[PDB]
Amino acid sequence: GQRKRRNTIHEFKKSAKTTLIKIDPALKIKTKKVNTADQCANRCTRNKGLPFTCKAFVFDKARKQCLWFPFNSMSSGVKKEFGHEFDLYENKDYIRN
């Protein structure tokens, strides 16, 4: 009855009004309708779920959706996007190199 620390979104790079794409052969993403970024976090931290342990994700505030990316705007074979009301959540411990 109190996730308190459960939410891990406080460890990702927060960049609202900013999202990311992908152009490399070994780079995909994941999407799930949702309510707020806080949610994506729990759904992003829980490893053993994303092929990339969810290194970064995004929350569409006008679409209440989630988009976990295996990388961040720093990764390669990839690029950043927008969405007006999206959200960029790149885990700092996973910031591609």
UniProtKB/Swiss-Prot annotation:
PAN domain location: 7-93
Residues recorded as bearing Pyrrolidone carboxylic acid in the entry: 2
Disulfide pairings: 40-66, 44-54
Name assigned to this protein: Hepatocyte growth factor alpha chain
Residues of the full protein shown: 31 to 127 of 728
